[PDB]
């Protein structure tokens, strides 16, 4: 019986070359595709910019065009999904989780174009949703697709490629190779049984997809907070308290995102039109705020450096927060195509900055800089809600480049997972996949 | 599927009692490593103060240098050969076994044997790293608490034993991330599913690190400063680097294994010839620890100096061959002690030299020798022990040059890829296989 182990250990890490060479392909394709989806959404916000320039005069007219364009780009995506692939609604992450369990269909002929264009619409519109959702789900279908098109057979290639696809799509979405690899092994893979996924392949894919996003997007970061200060040992307790705050609120937030999916479905009863309409209404309210309080709308990445340098009054932060809990729900709960990572980074960075601000004057002797509690709280919803700390910590670390905060960060993070488990929260990904798998067998 | 729904709704709900124990494994592995480390220091320290007393006559000081190194060597070689022969070598594969339930976690014997066994070999200035000691110790500190509280069932028995190993890897490099990563990447049961709580591994890895911090802060183990960056058109050079490492990774495995055989013949298993040859080997180090201070030691001292490029091109080749020699001798003679630390030193030097050749074959590239150092540093860690992920997150936390993350990943995956195709094997799982096979032999 052990006799077997000896035979396996002499065999370990010898993934069949053909599965490796195909990871390098899925990579380059998921890579380029993100860059596309990316340059796309940009142009679209940019056009909506140039179009507010033309109506420079007349104020209510401005608000109107700001509302309408976004409503119009919204719908186009709401429709595109409710019509040709209703699986590309929402993040699209748990759908790839399901697919690795073989419980969901990897319908890539439907999803590749629906998600790509569906997102370009919602994002280009400036709704509160992140590139990840789109780029990860797209990445998986880029995998499945090159798998089928080369008729590679057997459990391993069908898992490996499907996994190196999702990974490459998350690395390209935050310029974050490590956060990628880590995302699969911590969060994507089957959480309860053994699976046959080549780690050395996920790596080849996550490199190729990053060299693509490098080739095109180099010499500017998505987040630049510069080199912040350090954390003296007698400071640490404060990030544990930060971590408790995040951890009690993480599940309250999950209870909200789920309840809103239901409370939102009531308003259209599943009807492809009431839906695409409510969608234009929500994406419309965004393009408005995209221009009246440009902090309350958008992906988040823009307000991260501003909140971290501390340049917001204490009220402003509370306002941005409540206002963003409202805008982030509406967008993700209405099941428009688009991830929920990005807006959770933004959400945490704010609650982090505010906690740090209070701490900054409650302890002058500590020589605090509200900024550090920003960079602690940035990955903290990523841990109390999605419940996947390790991933989010390697993430925050690769974007903010502040390795000297690694201790406070882990604490805030672990604080949060711990407190969310004892206040009965669940992994927000696996909770959705569960409603979906359970609502599938709920038609017998 | 019916079941999947049920479990998704249940995931990440590790039993409180398992968490609270990870917390204590942690703190204990933590403090322990600090001890082992403050220990080794003191010992090399005394051997210096004793070289100052003999400041005049030369061959006298050569002798004293050979002598107490040989003396601290045997002390450890004996200590292991008598009271716990599993604490010889790295000690890492033994814990992998243990997690597979295939070796025994004999903590009553190992804790003290490894601890004092190491202080001996390392204090002496042999070419072995602190992890070996500190990881194995960590696991035993895990097992133990688990016994002492009679926590029952497969989960606690794996979880604690894993959080233990992690926390001692962390404290060994000040590297929390590398730690958790080491478990999921290389330590866990590679072929069957296991029930290890990752949320606990974290708690231990934190508490371990806070102990190490409380005592060891305000100085890094490696300080290379903020090095330059990597222009896109320079990446192919780190692929070439990764292929050199990947062909040589397996050659080095074959030498470590073969040397364990070619050294076993010198004593036949004989508790005395062994302890004797050990004093010889460890004596050789204490000599070179003072005649070519680069040839001897853990490595952490020459990583800075090679990366600033301050070595002539010959000196590098010299240091390198001289190291493949001293590294083997020490690790293959089954002295207690890790092989990570000296593979870092090895890679860093091969890296620096590749970099140096690159620096003048490409004046247009505006190269810094330095950066191929910091890509090569974790390269053996992936060509040999063949676990890149862990070794990359490692070099990252030590050298803090996140802007080299691309060349580093490439030189790394380059190596794993090229070892796999010139038929190399994970040097850990290779060792545990010799052992588990030599058991029912």
């Amino acid at each position: 019986r052990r006799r077997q182990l000896i035979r396996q250990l002499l065999e370990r890490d010898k993934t069949p070359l053909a599965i490796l060479f195909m990871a390098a392909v899925v990579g380059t394709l998921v890579g380029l595709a993100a860059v596309a989806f990316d340059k796309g959404v940009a142009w679209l916000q940019n056009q909506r910019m140039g179009a507010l320039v033309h109506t420079a005069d007349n104020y209510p007219l401005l608000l109107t065009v700001a509302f309408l364009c976004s409503a119009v780009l919204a719908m186009f995506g709401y429709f595109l999904v409710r019509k040709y692939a209703p699986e590309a609604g929402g993040s699209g992450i748990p759908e790839i989780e399901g697919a690795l369990e073989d419980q969901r269909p990897v319908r890539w002929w439907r999803v590749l174009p629906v998600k790509f264009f569906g997102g370009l619409g919602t994002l280009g519109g400036g709704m509160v949703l992140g590139r990840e959702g789109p780029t990860v789900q797209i990445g998986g279908n880029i995998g499945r697709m090159v798998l089928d098109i080369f008729r590679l057979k057997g459990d391993e290639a069908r898992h490996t490629l499907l996994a190196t696809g999702a990974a490459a799509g998350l690395a390209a979405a935050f310029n974050a190779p490590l956060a990628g690899i880590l995302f699969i092994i911590e969060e994507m893979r089957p959480q309860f049984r053994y699976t046959l996924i080549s780690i050395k392949a996920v790596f080849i894919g996550v490199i190729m997809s990053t060299i693509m996003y490098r080739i095109f997007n180099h010499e500017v970061a998505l987040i630049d907070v510069g080199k912040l200060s350090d954390a003296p040992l007698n400071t640490l307790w404060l990030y544990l308290i930060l971590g408790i705050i995040f951890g009690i609120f993480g599940p309250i937030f999950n209870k909200w995102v789920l309840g809103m999916q239901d409370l939102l479905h009531r308003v259209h009863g599943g009807n492809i039109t009431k839906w695409v309409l409510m969608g234009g209404a929500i994406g419309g309210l965004c393009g408005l705020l995209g221009f009246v309080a440009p902090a309350t709308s958008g992906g988040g990445f823009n307000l991260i450096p501003i909140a971290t340098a501390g340049n917001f009054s204490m009220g402003m932060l509370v306002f941005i927060f409540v206002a963003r809990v409202i805008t982030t729900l509406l967008c993700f709960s209405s099941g428009a195509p688009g991830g929920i990572f990005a807006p959770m980074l933004a959400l945490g960075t704010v609650l982090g900055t505010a906690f740090g601000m209070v701490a900054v004057e409650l302890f002058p002797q500590y020589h605090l800089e509200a900024g550090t509690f920003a960079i602690a709280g940035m990955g903290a919803l990523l841990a109390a809600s999605i419940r996947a700390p390790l991933t989010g910590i390697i993430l925050v670390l690769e974007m903010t480049d502040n390795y000297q905060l690694i201790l406070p960060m882990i604490i805030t993070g672990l604080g949060a997972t711990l407190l969310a488990q004892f206040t009965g929260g669940k992994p927000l990904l696996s909770a959705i996949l569960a409603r979906t798998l359970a609502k599938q067998e709920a038609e017998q | 599927r019916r079941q999947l729904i049920r479990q998704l709704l249940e995931r990440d709900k590790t039993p409180l009692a398992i968490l609270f124990m990870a917390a204590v494994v942690g703190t204990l592995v933590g403090l322990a490593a600090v001890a082992f480390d403050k220990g080794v220091a003191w010992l090399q320290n005394q051997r210096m103060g004793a070289l100052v007393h003999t400041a005049d006559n030369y061959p006298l000081l050569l002798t004293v240098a050979f002598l107490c190194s040989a003396v601290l060597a045997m002390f450890g070689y004996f200590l292991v050969r008598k009271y716990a022969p599993e604490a010889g070598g790295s000690g890492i594969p033994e814990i992998e076994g243990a997690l597979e339930d295939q070796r025994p976690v004999r903590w009553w014997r190992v804790l003290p044997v490894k601890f004092f066994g190491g202080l001996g070999t390392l204090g002496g200035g042999m070419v072995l790293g602190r992890e070996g000691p500190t990881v194995q110790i960590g696991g035993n500190i895990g097992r133990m608490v688990l016994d002492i509280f009679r926590l029952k069932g497969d989960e606690a028995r794996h979880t604690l034993l894993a959080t233990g190993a992690a926390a001692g890897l962390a404290a060994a490099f000040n590297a929390p991330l590398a730690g958790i990563l080491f478990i999921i990447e290389e330590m866990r049961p590679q072929f069957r599913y296991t029930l290890i709580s990752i949320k606990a591994v974290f708690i231990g890895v934190i508490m371990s690190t806070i102990m190490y911090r409380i005592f060891n802060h305000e100085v890094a183990l490696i300080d290379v400063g903020k090095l330059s960056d990597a222009p896109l058109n320079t990446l192919w050079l780190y692929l070439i680097l990764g292929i050199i490492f990947g062909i040589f990774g397996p050659i080095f495995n074959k030498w470590v294994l073969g040397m364990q055989d070619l050294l076993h013949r010198v004593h036949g298993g004989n508790i005395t010839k062994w302890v004797l040859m050990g004093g010889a080997i460890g004596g050789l180090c204490g000599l070179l620890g003072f005649v070519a201070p680069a040839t001897s030691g853990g490595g952490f001292n020459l990583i800075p100096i090679a990366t600033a490029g301050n070595f002539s091109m010959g000196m590098l080749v010299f240091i390198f061959v001289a190291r493949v020699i001293t590294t083997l001798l020490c690790f293959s003679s089954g002295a207690p002690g890790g092989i990570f630390a000296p593979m870092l030193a090895l890679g860093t030097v091969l890296g620096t030299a590749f970099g140096m050749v690159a620096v003048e074959l490409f004046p247009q590239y505006h190269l810094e020798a330095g950066t191929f150092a910091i890509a090569g540093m974790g390269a053996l860690l992936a060509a040999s022990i063949r676990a890149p992920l862990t070794g990359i997150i490692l070099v990252l936390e030590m050298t803090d040059n996140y802007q080299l993350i691309l060349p580093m990943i490439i030189t790394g995956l380059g190596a794993t890829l090229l070892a796999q195709f010139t038929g190399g094997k994970p040097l850990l799982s290779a060792i545990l296989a010799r052992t588990l096979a030599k058991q029912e032999a």
Epitope: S229, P232, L233, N234, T235, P364, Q365, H367, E369 | -
Partner: antibody
Framework: VRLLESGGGLVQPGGSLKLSCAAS????????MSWVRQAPGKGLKWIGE????????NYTPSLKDKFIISRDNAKDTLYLQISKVRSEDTALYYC??????????????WGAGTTVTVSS | DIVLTQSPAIMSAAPGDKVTMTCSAS?????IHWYQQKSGTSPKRWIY???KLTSGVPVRFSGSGSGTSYSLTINTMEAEDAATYYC?????????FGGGTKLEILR
């Protein structure tokens, strides 16, 4: 590292002066800087401290606008302006780089001082 | 504001002697620091974090304590150990200093 504070001397009572402290040999940012004074024979009492980018500036419980600390990051200098000088301000003035171990902060490296005489 | 009170305002001891001054806080404080000032010289940091020795400082030095009462100790005092020693604390803002303790060589 060296901290060289200049610009002391003889002030008339009621007038004011601008002490300057010039610092070489260490990365002048990353660090908080802080002024402290000593009335000839008598305690050390702390004037105030400034962070690296001038966003936090704390002073000792003292009259509304008695002291203006500032720092010029590029010229590597720390200033201190004292205004309406009465004679209790007659003391020797030292600058100092702040650090910590566990993070209960200490005064890391002091300079020579300069003397301020307040008299008519 | 926390007031530290020094032990012997002034005191003399023969060269070779166990010497002990005392910081006596008005309330609680933790991890105090010690500074050394020779005549017309600028203060040096001597002991930090109640007992860690500023790298450089002779090993004969060693302070400690806690709660409300701390103390610096020379173990066999010397020539060069004539100075003034100030305890400083920053456990609570704003931070503060002692009356000083004047250590004069006895002969």
């Amino acid at each position: 590292v060296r901290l060289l504070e200049s610009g002391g001397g003889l002030v008339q009572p009621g007038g004011s002066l601008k002490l300057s402290c010039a610092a070489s040999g260490f990365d002048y940012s990353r660090y908080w800087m802080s002024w402290v004074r000593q009335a000839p024979g008598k305690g050390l009492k702390w004037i105030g401290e400034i962070n690296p980018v001038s966003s936090t500036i704390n002073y000792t419980p003292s009259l509304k606008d008695k002291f203006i600390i500032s720092r010029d990051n590029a010229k590597d200098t720390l200033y201190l302006q004292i205004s309406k000088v009465r004679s209790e301000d007659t003391a020797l003035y030292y600058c100092a780089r702040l650090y910590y171990g566990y993070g209960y902060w200490y005064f890391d490296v002091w300079g020579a001082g300069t003397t301020v005489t307040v008299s008519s | 504001d926390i007031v530290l009170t020094q032990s012997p305002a002034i005191m003399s001891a023969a060269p070779g002697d166990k010497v002990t001054m005392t910081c006596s806080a008005s309330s609680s404080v933790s991890y105090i620091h010690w500074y050394q000032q020779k005549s017309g010289t600028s203060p040096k940091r001597w002991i930090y974090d109640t007992s860690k020795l500023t790298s450089g400082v002779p090993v004969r030095f060693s302070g400690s304590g806690s709660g409300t009462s701390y103390s610096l100790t020379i173990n066999t005092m010397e020539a060069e150990d004539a100075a003034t020693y100030y305890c400083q604390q920053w456990s609570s803002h704003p931070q503060t200093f002692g009356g000083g303790t004047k250590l004069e060589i006895l002969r």
